[PDB]
Amino acid sequence: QPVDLGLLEEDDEFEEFPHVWEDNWDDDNVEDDFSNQLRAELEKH
């Protein structure tokens, strides 16, 4: 089975009305959930 693109919670399905921050900005680490970023990728071809 493939990703039911219908029941997939999209990056844009906003919520009308309702570690999660990342220390220093001048950070130049090298990994995880802040690393790349779908969309930013595309831009940097």
Binding site: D11, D12, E15, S35, L42
Partner: protein
């Protein structure tokens, strides 16, 4: 698409105006609403699937030059930045195959709209637009061309990424007409018939100009005045943010690239109020972002408003000099300094006095002055940059609260200043109107890892290399042996301990009157700098420093007395023997 210079060029042109009538006809009745194929599945129960889950842990990884064929990724989608997406143009040929493709008829895509190719076999905004009007349940009268233009902009851009970013998960199942139309109606179901509103919508629309904690993305680096600001889109509409120097610099540096997501508690709608609508937004309008309230989000996360408006506590070490003000620090109060009554001069500037300097100049005296209770604090994390929070006009119920050795989480404690003189790691928190204090427990060791209580400086220390006092400051008690007030500046007050071990104090403030010789002085908050080697170490009297002939403090008296003693049993030849010493303690003459 066929090259029938005619016919195919007509078959269409006919199917169109034939349609133009359909849309036109709608304009004759009250179209009852009719939700799309998406707003109905997502609106149903059915276990949904996070973007993250779908992908299954992995993160946005580029195509692979080649291998993109291994999954098949339109070299065409692979060709769309966040600024051309408004165009793109599907190649109906690439998506339908000769048959019906050849017939002007067109294509009836998801929901029922008719996507009718352009003379030259294309599909775009004004093209998908008409196709949404040709859709059931939609009321052409409710959506501008601009509207679908924009909403068309992001939908491709998103799908574009998704296939390019996770070439395996969404390989070649996202970008195409069936979706851009299956979804264009969604946004319509969402926004028009159900009224749900994007964040920047309620925001810009002033129906919730809250402008609190948003998760926006960068859609373009505005080039105007060589790098103006940037465009921030929340998936539904975009805005140019007003940036601060710490941030902007990041754009330049290539720190903040396009497509990246930001989290931001700051949020300010600078420029124009009145209350508009996302598309008809006044050019004279920016969405202020502040580098100390903002940070990069998880690739997935989700655009728009976040959950809690409770400021995220970020390390105090960071924060920019001129980086906008902070909303939350999880500090651990180092020291607490003497309340000051700063009277605001007339020609400008101010004057700082003490609980006592006031009384004097309080009778010696329309006034105009504000108390200032400063205190040195450091982040509960690690390193520790020991900042100097400045609470102004402090509330009486405050002193009994904020207390050295204790862990507190201060809010909106910002303005963040200082930078002059030397170096640069000189931030400067300042309590603000909305600022608040929240006390939090500390693990014995962790505190004993950042907090070193207020001891009493034993002079013999000022001479040991390894000596490094907490917050380069110290409290003392000693016998004044001579006060020098050279003309110009730099008064001096040499002290001494029972052992006739000397030390010196250069004053920045004014000589506290009762400070003449023979006076056992008790000092608090003396600024310490490395003094070994020094025939007689120097301590500097700051503005925080204090001098009392008879300290109210307990342990001080405990000492001022305890010493006033051991000295007596030597007074039979002290203050003299003492002077005799410092006398030559200014020797090493040439010859």
């Amino acid at each position: 698409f066929p090259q029938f210079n005619k016919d195919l060029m007509s078959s269409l042109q006919n199917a169109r105006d034939l349609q133009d009538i359909r849309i036109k006809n709608k304009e004759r009745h009250h179209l009852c609403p009719q939700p799309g194929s998406l707003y109905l599945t997502k609106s149903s129960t059915l276990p949904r699937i996070s973007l993250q889950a779908a992908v299954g842990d992995s993160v946005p990884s580029a195509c692979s030059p080649k291998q993109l064929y291994m999954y098949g990724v339109s070299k065409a989608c692979i060709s769309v930045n966040s600024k051309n997406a408004e165009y793109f143009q599907f190649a109906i040929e690439d998506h339908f195959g000769k048959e019906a493709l050849c017939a002007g008829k067109g294509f009836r895509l998801a929901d029922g709209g008719w996507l009718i190719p352009s003379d030259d076999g294309k599909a775009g905004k004004e093209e998908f637009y008409r196709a949404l009007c040709d859709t059931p349940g939609v009321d052409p009268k409710l959506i501008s061309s601009v509207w679908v233009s924009n909403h068309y902009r992001w939908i491709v851009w998103k799908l574009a990424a998704m296939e390019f970013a996770f070439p395996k998960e969404f390989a070649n199942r996202c970008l195409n007409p069936e979706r851009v139309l299956l979804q264009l109606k969604y946004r319509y179901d969402v926004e028009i018939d159900n009224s749900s509103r994007s964040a920047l919508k309620k925001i810009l629309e002033r129906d919730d100009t809250a402008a609190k904690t948003l998760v926006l993305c960068v859609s373009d680096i505005i080039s105007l005045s060589k790098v103006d600001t940037i465009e921030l889109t929340d998936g539904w509409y975009a805005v140019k943010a007003q940036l601060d120097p710490p941030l902007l610099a990041l754009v330049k540096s290539g720190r903040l690239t396009v497509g990246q997501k930001i989290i931001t508690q700051g949020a300010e709608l600078v420029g124009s109020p009145d209350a508009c609508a996302p598309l008809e937004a006044p050019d004279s309008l920016r969405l202020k972002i502040s580098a100390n309230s903002t940070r990069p989000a998880r690739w997935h996360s989700k655009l728009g408003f976040f959950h809690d408006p409770r400021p995220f506590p970020l390390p105090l070490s960071s924060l920019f000099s001129d980086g906008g003000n902070v909303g939350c620090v999880d500090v651990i109060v180092q020291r607490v300094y003497p309340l000051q009554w700063v009277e605001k001069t007339v020609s400008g500037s101010y004057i700082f006095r003490n609980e006592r300097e006031e009384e004097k100049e309080a009778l010696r005296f329309s006034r105009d002055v504000s108390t200032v209770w400063k205190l040195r604090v450091t982040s509960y994390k690690k390193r520790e940059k020991s900042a100097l929070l400045s609470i102004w006009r402090p509330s009486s119920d405050l002193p009994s609260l904020l207390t050295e050795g204790q862990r507190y989480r201060i809010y909106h404690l910002s303005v963040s200043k200082s930078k002059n003189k030397f170096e640069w790691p000189s931030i400067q928190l300042t309590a603000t109107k909305r600022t608040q204090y929240q006390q939090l427990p500390v693990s014995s060791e962790t505190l004993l890892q950042l907090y070193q209580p207020r001891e009493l400086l034993p002079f013999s220390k000022l001479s040991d290399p390894a000596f490094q006092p907490p917050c380069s400051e110290v409290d003392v008690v000693g016998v004044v042996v001579s006060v020098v007030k050279p003309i110009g500046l730099a008064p001096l007050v040499y002290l001494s301990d029972e052992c006739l071990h000397l030390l010196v104090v250069k004053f920045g403030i004014d000589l506290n009157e009762d400070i003449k010789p023979r006076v056992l002085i008790a000092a608090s908050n003396l600024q310490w700098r490395p003094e070994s080697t020094s025939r007689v170490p120097t301590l500097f009297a700051g503005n925080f420093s204090v001098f009392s002939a008879s300290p109210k403090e307990a342990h001080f008296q405990e000492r001022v007395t305890n010493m006033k003693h051991a000295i007596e049993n030597i007074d039979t030849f002290y203050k003299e023997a003492e002077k005799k010493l410092i006398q030559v303690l200014k020797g090493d003459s040439p010859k």
